[model samples]
Target: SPYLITGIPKDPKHPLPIRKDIDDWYLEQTSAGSNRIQLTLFVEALTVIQNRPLNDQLSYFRLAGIHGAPWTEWDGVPGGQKDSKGNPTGFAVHNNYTFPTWHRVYVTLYEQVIYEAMLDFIKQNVPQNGKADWENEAKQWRLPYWDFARFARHGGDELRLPILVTMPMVKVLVPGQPGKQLSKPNPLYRFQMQTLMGTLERPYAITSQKTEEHGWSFDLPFDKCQSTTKYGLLENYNADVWADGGQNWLRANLALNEHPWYQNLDGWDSVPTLQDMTFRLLTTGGLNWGEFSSTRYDDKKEENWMNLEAIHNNVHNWVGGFMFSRPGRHDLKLWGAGHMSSVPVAAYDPIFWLHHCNIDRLTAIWQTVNSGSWFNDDKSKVSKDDDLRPFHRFCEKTRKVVFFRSDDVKDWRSLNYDYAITKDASRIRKEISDLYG
Candidate 1:
């Protein structure tokens, strides 16, 4: 049976842990003082798991289905195997009702693998601490989400790149030496492809469109705007170019909340508020699942209001950048080559987890507000009881593929974790006083 997977809080009290913290935890379990030895083993485990053959049950290729990759084709949809011009398809669910639910399960799968890797390291290296301490740490370890809006809410440096995601190399203290530092490439920042299975071919056309040479020779960056091939590279592409591009992109996207146009966007009526969330809870009739999940692209009357999915798409485009282009035309470009921009390769970047974790957090918030009225209408293309399609889990023991339905994941507690939001005391008091008086 598939058990519950909890996401640990990434609030100010239990903030996102840095790569240095992960290094320290791993080093503490090891007897050696050398950073090389400790980091080597750590990378070895992660690389081995990620580079497993595509057919393997636990391979990264198989597990990345939440965003799609490796598997280019599915049944019933012609040309669905690949995108518009025969590129591999990412099979990601977007602008649809399954968006939130599918991602919740996807992120959980990632959390499970990470948890397993940490446990394996501890068990093999730290026998002296005994199993009791190991169990306690493992239980508390959960995936950390990036609260993008939180930075804007408090007037923090919203444009500052998170050190955990952008630092090229991280320094770890030599185990016994208090003042000494040992530098290593941050594993959390990038996933280095060691085996042929992990490599993407030239033309950057995803898997299934194979070429003679390997595609990406180096580790993928957190966010890059470069072309997949030499023909698509920018005229002055260099280190400075790369740095400036990323900085500019972050600056524009992080400041989106402050823009007046944000509230007036086509899908949603306004920036989501506690009152609006409460209203959603009260309305239990009609096609609630789809309405709550996504806004219709065809609805001309509600053209001014942006829905949650539309706002989410803006984030993806802002981070991914304008990278995809045609053979001869540079003017006609697609918005993303960065992991966040595309579904197939998004999970390869560490920040993808943080972004999705935030999405999952919002979904949880909506679910909490709505509670028992989560699914009220059956007019959707997908029924409430139907198993989520195009997303399946390969069972190692059973050697079978299992599908997860919305019904199985309605309760966060049943999934074995809950979110903790710090309430504004003054705001609460004002609301109460206004209502009573």
Candidate 2:
């Protein structure tokens, strides 16, 4: 059943210390044993807010449902977790699979609070005035945080791919034989994710890049670009969140096999085998940050990030300029593709999403200002020709439906959400007013 929300709820009952130790502490809690209640609750809250008008949604986020914490706490969790000084231990955090990593935990906790709050709010309306001395000392609210721009910027910083990658639910398959699952993914994965986290954390990067890339030019690969990677059979099953039968969720599990070589294997006539002779090469390499007109290239490789101001200043300089300027023309400047002088971990950084999101946002911005035609609707935009499955495409090996809709495509929005353009006042106000204001 869909979740229901009634009112703002208090943050989890755990104290700041326990909450602060959420990552290490949460690991000790078993999948079935951990805070499942919160998971269910947060989903309800999301449903409530998402159903609201865009402006109302902004307002909803501004409300303070917990003590000393506004909706910003949700964004703060990841922001704090990534910064070395933010965590009590003063160590870097990691997110291997990107959005799934941090967002899963974030959403799980959010769900728990909303679930309980809905139950409470439905019974009695939450006090609008700051009169209710709730036992937890959580704040009272009269209006939702209508500052969609603030929420968008703040939320944008926190919602990078690094955090989401680790989520059990967010799934993506790169080309490779499944390898042994580390009790945890490698530290490089974590570090890369953290570094990338810094890429899109600031507000300047998002809008600046969009406005800078005013009109498309030959220098940029904005046009004449195509993706080289393909999809797999279980890819759809892994992607589908719901299906006619339980097969959708079930296939999701199999496709996300933890082992490097064998994770996606299920006994199907269509599952590609090493024997298929059409085995394609997988890569961790792609485009370079310098090559892409989206990011300005700098040679500073040894900057220490402990001083938050210095780090912010440095990022503001490079990231800001890239955002505000047009990417110079190059032979080819594909993003997320391997570059010649690439950092291995950088390829895996969870921040990849934010960078791409910014890129996507920039492209969208260009389309609007110039009144350029939008990219034609194509299923290929979803995945590759070779990688097609029954639900998505025809199998090369067998003419049968190798995959089903009940398989791939869990939440298409999870992968493709409606991006705001300059034409939309709400979107423009949310993105531009703060930076340009």
Candidate 3:
């Protein structure tokens, strides 16, 4: 009953309810026979989206492209997000107050699409004997969050990358038989780009055009990049290209699996083999909206300068294999950063979706804890009507595309998805302690 009390959207006018997104570890943990059916259905649905042909608007490449790269318009717009006063022109979803809200809607769009796919999957692929049961379970399925903070625990004094994402292949629990399982290519491991990377804004192989003037520059060489060419397919991902493919991209990030200590290079220092910063952020109280929203315009350099965006930057480095070193600081994370390091190309990586899902999850948890904390009208000047461009939907009621804004997404529950965490501050603290503390 902690869900939204007001009307939830319905087609035939029946009340709809909020769907809770589960932690990735809980959903994917081994020997969780009770959760097997849901897991298999999730993997299947994810791969279905990932495998969709490049033409579909809902395709992984197309949807992820909204973050950056391939500067494409979305929804029904003929051109990409148009230039407007006080509104971001293109891919305007990061860095400002819109950071959490923009991403919130973005992830919701993704969740909605995946839900549609999951429903169809059960109807088309699942065996008839289990069809109705699978359909009901699929209705409850949504995206999972990868809480990077809990990368290790005292249970083994061990550090580990999310096994679900690291392995090239994964074992999915069979729908009915708890003991039976199926091995399939883990879509989270890497995303294969169905379309060629170098195009508009991507000039004729560096003919003296400043890349940024046209668009953004890619550190990777684009000469022979083909449409079917795979991206994020790194052995140990770094700034390099291989004509022969995975042969050259050896799995060096295997260390990212275990025995890795991350540095909070974005301004603060790092601690945990992973997630030390995350623990500090969640445990520390009194961080106001300005402090928690983003690192933008925040030059105070105080002891508690860490913000949500700052921590997000470090995690990008961690997952992308960007290391810290004192070599002019150029080669540190700037030059050697992996797919997740670059803004435009970052979302192209499959893990970007999973990582961001968790970021939004954290946003909700933080929102509940600091209920009174939010933007200042005079200083921040941010409002619910502030346009979140390229993130809109057609309203059957209004008969036109209506863009989402901060106020529109003020309540996470209104978005039709929720987290498993509760409203009790002390109780939730215990939950946080068990997971990330």
Candidate 4:
């Protein structure tokens, strides 16, 4: 039986069935535990899957391609091909109205794989528990989201990376070595590429470094230098370089301070009120929605920077560091470069799912607000009923290729998940106009 995936609650006091504390979180079979534990299990499962050989169906490399890759097609459909220069010349919809819907299916597909892996892990290890108990525990497991804005609202220690993500090592019971738990270097911190995939080593332009002649380059033998390296995992070229090693930490804090409204609904720029969100939801036509979804990298004419896609890109830029840094004007010079910043390699990072989970959550919110209203209705250039190309799925039993339609994926509940926060247009409008307006 399929179960619902809940959103990571916005408020810490929002009464989740899982454990709430930050430090005392571990993934165990107990009835009640922390989200950190679920996340830990997810990381462990991903590591196991990733360690498998490239040809294996469940291997991380094969799974990551569903999002972006060098392949020309998938199951006969275009699979987001890249040019010699590694620019996205084929599928993988972006800067369009389909951006939100396409990503929703992508994230859901990834979540399905992760969920399958997690269930297998629980079934093999926790034999002490009854089958029903194990099934229940597995059913409750869903991808956790990183509420960056929530942290900004709380300030203080919350501003830094979640301890689970930043910590160098974490204790877990190794698979096949049951009851022999040990502290191992966390896999979630970063994904080290075993083999070079499409354009991973290429030097490209990032938004921030576009003014300079050459943009940043990705160094191979991807080392884990969270504590010692100057930029660590995160870096922003536009900001002042940190003297110490916590460049990523400092840069994240800077983004929070600078884009307080985007990070959290606070400070002077904190104006993503219910009213603002409603306009995005109520807006008609694919052209309008596309502009709201995402603007062209070099669109000098448009200044609409507060859309959902813009906020989503900002989070990517903030997390991926130098590769996504947009200092002045966001030109098209630097498109695909680093792992986290580029579409082809973004899924390689474990954090990408959590980030997309939030995006999906926001989409769910918008859907609830404007029910039955999606994309361009009249089969215009931007039609919601159109098939989301290259986004193909394989039937596990039949081994048949099936394409997903935007209309089919509109209802998240149909895919078996509900958000922690579900808001409608009227509710959002009232909340913003009354509280913040």
Candidate 5:
């Protein structure tokens, strides 16, 4: 597999290029620029997508699973799907060279659906007189990123976690009327699965089934979950996986890490903050793609031990409230583990998107800082030409898939979006230093 070039050929002129924004930035949610109407548009558009019927391909349920869950193909053939009893179907590539590239494509696909929803919402709701302006704003809208590395005074806790992300409810401008605003539940606060008939089907307590663990199945509450839990419901006590993912294939026997919004990274100090490594990641002049991209220790390159993947993991643990201890499995009380803590259920966590966008933004910044640095078969297992499966942008006319290889996504502009700080290398460097400090 490592030596194979199993990618489709790319045409010089793409019929419907996957470009949006003409060109724009995914602004920081905590920044002054991402305020009011812009923020409202994001929340409303996400609600539209999240509300899609469970059977719809673009629904959050389906899209999130492509990262790893029910373990099926996007094309919808259940028989061809792998059973939960085996290793993951190689779709959710991680812990290796493809990590950054694969996630870049994954997030791009995620944003594309939201962009369409935003456009659809504008067309159906906004009055004709204001259509052009609203559409323009939608056109300019890209997904919001939460830069965990960059901290500032926001709300009461200075963004211990984004205040907006943790709110149980939010107020936003009504889609059709600019004059009126209303309060509603914040979709980002939690993402629970809903059916066409409007019944809730979520794990009483989110569970995790390791990608490699065999003889185990993702049944009941394991497959369906909502993240950032406060207190896992007692009824689903039998839903959890190996207490801490034991090598001997232990069972959770219980779980923890709930209600992350109430807790901050500074509280338990599993990882007090991610600012230090982020600052170093962008500033490490000597670290090449080999050492910069993942956690693989470079022989004798002692100082280069820190990598992007490691830095990214800290955000997940902190947000998931891992508490740095081996996962608990006692039936004593609620273990309180948030969904962001584990891979299988993390996608269900709305913060997963915001956090991943920040990861992409960081990778983009690193790309700018080290122009032309990339990993290939020569130094890594995966290459720039490998197929980032279930992530192809289909050419509607020809109905053919255009697989995005690592090299294909090397230019974020070609994908039609960018990070605000990526505008200038020098400016980004300056910002990283100031913010990460």
Candidate 6:
């Protein structure tokens, strides 16, 4: 047990505003920086538990249990994995699957374990029940090394990079069985509704202001925009004005299916399932094949997979791998001041991290495989404004945001974050370099 059994810090900052704050923290911590320590501890703990040394690693879950219960364990239930002898007694776990499915599951569990360890460490070291807020106490534990690695490895420092960014307009999609109307509401929907309503009234934020300041004008030309006066009932169907008394707007607002009592409950089949439902509501509808509009070109094999070239082209690339020559297509994502009031709820879902990882991975591949590819074919580097704005706005003649110099823009020679590590590589590297070295 790497953690102390003093329970979790009762301080407001360390514990989070609500229990769900742990979920939010998990989302950010998992992706914000390289979770190296967390990842290392997680692998060690999993190995210890699975190798018939359960008590040695009980601290991992014992501390994590303070905040989040184990959803997946040996016994397959929260607080039920240990046997009468206090040994781990459940089906032996192994990793095997197509497309690194089990690999990702391992990563996700590691993320949860790290969060628990951090919290448990805080409770043991800090006086949370005293006058000190947990935030102040937790700040001492901020891992600068880990943060730097995360930023360099991921895109934290590259926030200003000239990469084309696209996020879906999630409101159009609805969760659950769309055929069945939301009758019994839940508290989750209440928070969502509150957040949505707040966005409508205050149609502004620092990011929006930054975009406008940087000449990131709307994708649609201001002159071409029209009023919703012509059609009485038909006007409501328009997605552009859905939130402003349009039928689509009303439908979006009315579509929430949350209830107060159902909000706090955490279980594999409960909160996460509902979270999935809410994600569907915000990101997908049954009308689409799955939640996402984009599909791997390889996935289209039924129509094009039979072709050798097509298979070669697709298989040669990973699912998220993007070809530089063929930027494929950009689908309908999101817009502002029209049918949707804000980003779809699914965009905020924790699963959103997985989606973005794949997106980021693909973008990195495109840069690597097609280093010569330039934005609009000019040797001049693509500015953030040019690449990141809505695809429709790509034609806009606005000056590009000059936050970074062209030299600063990541090139193939400078990008080392794309290295995918293997266990053998990790072990061999450690052997060549002493622990202190």
Which candidate ranks first by TM-score, i.e. highest?
3
Q: Specify the poorest-scoring 10-residue window by lDDT in model 2.
A: 223-232
lDDT of each: 0.47, 0.22, 0.57, 0.49, 0.57, 0.23
Give a tens-digit lDDT track for model 4, residues 1-437. 11222222223333223212222233222225322345546667777877766445456655565565433343345444664465554455666667787787767766666767777777776555344544454466565555444432241333334455565677665544445566777765655443223223322111111211134554311122211121232334322212112324455445433442323333334354322443443343333344445544224423322566766765665555433233344533322123454554456566677777767766665566555546644322355666666556544466666566776676666565665455344465454334223
Residue pairs in clash, model 3 = 73-80, 235-250, 235-251, 235-252, 236-250, 236-252, 264-270, 384-407
Per-residue alpha-carbon lDDT of model 3 for 1-437, expressed as tens digits?
Answer: 11111212333322233333333443544545555666677677878998776567688877877776555666654334433334223474666666877888777777777777777877777777888777766665556776666644332443344556656777776655546778998777666643334532332111111122113343343322322222233323432442213311222234333423332345335334345556677778866766677765364432133577777775665566443122244333222334565555567666677778888878877887777666753434454357666676555577666776676767876665566774456687788777766
Worst 10 residues of 5 by lDDT: 247-256
Instruction: Give each model's clash number.
Output: 11, 55, 8, 7, 12, 18
Model 6 C-alpha lDDT per residue in residues 328-392, reported as the tens digit of each score: 14411111222111111212112222333332332333233333433323222222122210001
Name the lDDT value of residue 161 in candidate 3: 45
Q: Output the lDDT of residue 139, model 1.
A: 50
* Candidate 5 error regions (>4 Å): 1-35, 76-86, 154-159, 195-273, 296-305, 323-335, 394-400
Q: Is candidate 1 or candidate 5 better by TM-score?
A: 5
Candidate order by decreasing TM-score: 3, 5, 4, 1, 2, 6
Better of 1 and 3 by lDDT: 3
Q: How well does model 4 score by local distance difference test? A: 0.49
By lDDT, the better pick of 4 and 5 is 5
Supply the TM-score for candidate 2.
0.23
Worst 10 residues of 3 by lDDT: 204-213
RMSD list, candidates in order:
9.6, 24.8, 6.8, 8.6, 9.0, 24.5
Residue runs of model 2 more than 4 Å from their true location after superposition: 1-18, 25-34, 57-306, 309-437
Worst window of 10 by summed lDDT in candidate 1: 225-234
